């Protein structure tokens, strides 16, 4: 049971003109594609012993943690969640790595502190990168709002949203 | 001094993903085209003695007022600002009347109580109707956000926005 056929279009245009719930902190991990997951700091601590056989965790926070009782490989890309940091510089490599994970069915968790702005930006970028079908402006609006509806908050950082738009739309 | 060339596009996509100021009540009349104006109840009371030579006022509120010391013609279309009323039924005639006004340079004020939802919807409809150039989805997003940025609040009513989208986009 899904919505097809220009209900998505009204959904999108209404969301695009203010029909948006106030930001609600995301709590549980979200499976976004077959092997790619999106979460927050707690979710990463919880990653050793979750239903998923993670091979990788992509740590987007500033601090290099370990999960030493586990065999998960922790990739650290330290970024700040601010309106000045350039996150686009890592777009190509990160989306490339995530697609490799999806090809090899190697589960990977993409997380930040909140699971909203450094991690949601990389998940958005991945989704945009994998779109060969749909007009980017519309794919962008659909992805953004459906992910926000799902998670409660998604790339609330305006500068991160600007960087995705420039990279993948304009 | 204007923004052209894909700054409008980033502006639009950012506004479309949550970059929106909280609704602020509009106070002064807004000239939207050469002879078409948008305002609230006070603005209409003030219409007899304003810098503009109104020939017409389009009263979208429920109550039939008069301005008996004036020669302004008051057209009454009574509508409620609610999430159930069908405003689309008057779209064709209203936009037709407004375009005639613009052709004959006959100044006309479009108002409701707030100057935000019954009146902004008819102004939006007019603008959409007069667009023969731009893709409707994009013209819609541009008009909506630039009018909201200008006025402070514009078609905040979600059902009125749905009706414009259905009429003019889908």
Q: Where are the domains of chain B?
A: 1-170
Name the experiment that determined this structure: X-ray
Of A13, A155, A161, nearest to B140 by CB-CB distance is A13
**B contacts of A5 (beta carbons < 8 Å):** none
Q: Could you tell me which CATH class the domain B1-170 is placed in?
A: alpha beta
Residues 6 or more apart in contact with residue A38 via CB below 8 angstroms: A29, A30, A32, A109, A110, A111, A115, A119, A120, A123, A151
* Cβ-contact B139, B128 below 8 angstroms: yes
* Cβ-contact B60, B119 below 8 angstroms: yes
Residue A128 CA to chain centroid, in angstroms?
A: 11
**Distance from C-alpha of A55 to C-alpha of A100, rounded to nearest angstrom:** 12
**Distance from C-alpha of B144 to C-alpha of B12, rounded to nearest angstrom:** 10
Q: Does A62 touch chain B (CB under 8 A)?
A: no
DSSP state of A59: E
Interchain CB distance below 8 Å, A161 and B137: no
* Cβ-contact B168, B128 below 8 angstroms: yes
Resolution (A): 2.0
**Distance from C-alpha of A123 to C-alpha of B168, rounded to nearest angstrom:** 33
**Distance from C-alpha of B37 to C-alpha of B62, rounded to nearest angstrom:** 19
Of A19, A137, A158, nearest to B14 by CB-CB distance is A158
Q: Does B21 touch chain A (CB under 8 A)?
A: no
Q: Does B161 touch chain A (CB under 8 A)?
A: yes
Residues 6 or more apart in contact with residue B9 via CB below 8 angstroms: A137, A169, A170
Give the CA dihedral A140, A146, A147, A150, nearest 10 degrees. Answer: 180
Q: Does B18 touch chain A (CB under 8 A)?
A: yes
**A contacts of B144 (beta carbons < 8 Å):** 17
What Rg, from alpha-carbon coordinates, does chain B have?
A: 16
Interchain CB distance below 8 Å, B161 and A6: no
Interchain CB distance below 8 Å, A17 and B170: no
Give the CA dihedral B56, B61, B62, B63, nearest 10 degrees. Answer: -60
Report the first-to-last Cα separation within chain A, whole angstroms: 33
Report the first-to-last Cα separation within chain B, whole angstroms: 33
Integer angstrom CA distances of residue B30 from A102, B67, B133, B147: 53, 21, 24, 9
* Cβ-contact A75, A58 below 8 angstroms: yes
DSSP secondary structure, B33-98, as one string:
SSSEEEE-HHHHHTGGGSSS--SEEEE-SSS----TTS--EEEE-----SSS---GGGHHHHHHHH
How big is chain A, counted in residues? 170
**A contacts of B143 (beta carbons < 8 Å):** none
Q: Does B162 touch chain A (CB under 8 A)?
A: yes
* Cβ-contact B54, B75 below 8 angstroms: no
Of B15, B141, B170, nearest to A10 by CB-CB distance is B170
Interchain CB distance below 8 Å, B165 and A137: no
B80, B111, B81: which is closest to B94 by C-alpha? Answer: B111
Expressed in percent and rounded to 5, the helix, strand and coil fractions of chain A are 40, 10, 45
**Largest interatomic CA distance in chain B:** 49
* Cβ-contact B53, B70 below 8 angstroms: no
């Amino acid at each position: 049971i899904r919505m097809d056929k220009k209900s998505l279009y009204k959904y999108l245009l209404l969301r695009s003109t203010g029909d948006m719930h106030k930001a609600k902190s995301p709590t549980i991990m979200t499976r976004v594609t077959n092997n790619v997951y999106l979460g927050n700091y707690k979710n990463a601590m919880d990653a050793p012993s979750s239903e998923v056989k993670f091979k990788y965790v992509l740590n987007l926070t500033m601090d290099k943690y370990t999960l030493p009782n586990s065999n998960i490989n922790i990739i650290h890309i330290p970024l700040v969640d601010d309106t000045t940091t350039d996150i686009s510089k890592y777009f190509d490599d990160v989306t490339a790595f995530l697609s490799k994970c999806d090809q090899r069915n190697e589960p990977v968790l993409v997380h930040s502190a909140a699971g909203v702005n450094r991690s949601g930006a990389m998940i958005l970028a991945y989704l945009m990168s994998k779109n060969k079908e749909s007009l980017p402006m519309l794919y962008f609006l659909y992805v953004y709002h459906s992910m926000r509806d799902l998670r409660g908050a998604f790339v609330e950082n305006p500068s991160f949203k600007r960087q995705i738009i420039e990279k993948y739309v304009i």
